[PDB]
Design a protein around this ligand. Structure first.
Ligand SMILES: *[C@@H]1O[C@H](CO[C@@H]2O[C@@H](C)[C@@H](O)[C@@H](O)[C@@H]2O)[C@@H](O[C@@H]2O[C@H](CO)[C@@H](O)[C@H](O)[C@H]2NC(C)=O)[C@H](O)[C@H]1NC(C)=O
Length: 218
């Protein structure tokens, strides 16, 4: 809608807090019958009712966790801002939230914010010592654990290796782990060659560079 003002997407650290803005642009004279926030699955999260007052009907999104960012509404105008604050974000607070204003007698208007919960992963790379030999094996590995969304691992290498990585879910629901094994058939002129594991993830401004010096044996 035009009459309702929201952010198309919002981002908050897992366990952290977010504000979902919402306002009724056209500063008209028409009363706000009520305001309500619904997830797209149809779960009403928070609402200000006509004469009843402010409400938070679902168990999972209790009053202890959600609240309207502007809580002392004098007169209708005071209603034009339905900005909602989440504290203690869980993965399940993820969603497409619809901010809807009911106006009298018809009809209602509404905006949609995508609420995304982000989890910063833990990353590390180590070298695997290997003996020279005809089969390719993993000479180096990098692990990006507990990231949301999944991190992206690439490698910077002067050797002619294939990085083949695999994904498992992390210990935390919502989060995923990437294990990247860099393989090339261990030659000898690998030894001491600095190779970088590069992890990209939303929670970092720039890719993370993890240096590794390769070993080879005998
Ligand atoms: C949250 O919504 C965004 C935006 O998408 C709109 O409404 C959705 C319900 C759906 O109908 C989309 O087609 C609409 O664009 C979603 O972002 C899209 O995600 C889809 C997978 O459903 C993906 O293929 C598209 O590339 C995304 N669209 C755009 C324009 O980037 C997102 O998936 C929704 N998230 C959740 C958890 O529901």
């Amino acid at each position: 809608d035009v009459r309702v003002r929201v952010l198309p997407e919002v981002r908050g650290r897992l366990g952290g807090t977010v504000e979902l803005p919402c306002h009724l642009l056209p500063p008209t004279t028409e009363r706000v019958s009520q305001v309500t926030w619904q997830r797209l699955d149809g779960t009403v999260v928070a609402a200000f009712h006509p004469s009843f007052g402010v409400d938070f009907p679902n168990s999972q999104f209790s009053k202890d966790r959600l609240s309207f960012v502007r809580a002392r509404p004098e007169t209708n105008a005071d209603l034009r801002d339905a900005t909602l604050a989440f504290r203690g974000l869980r993965v399940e607070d993820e969603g497409n939230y619809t901010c809807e204003f009911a106006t009298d007698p018809n009809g209602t208007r509404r905006g949609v914010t995508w609420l995304r919960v982000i989890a910063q992963p833990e990353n590390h790379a180590e070298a695997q010592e290997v003996t020279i030999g005809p089969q390719s094996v993993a000479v180096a590995r990098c692990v990006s654990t507990g990231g949301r969304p999944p991190a992206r691992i690439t490698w910077i290498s002067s050797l002619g290796g294939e990085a083949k990585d695999t994904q498992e879910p992390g210990i935390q629901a919502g989060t995923v782990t990437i294990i990247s094994r860099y393989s090339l058939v261990p030659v000898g002129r690998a030894d001491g060659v600095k190779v970088t594991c590069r992890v990209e993830h939303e929670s970092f401004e720039e890719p993370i560079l993890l240096p590794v010096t390769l070993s080879v044996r005998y």
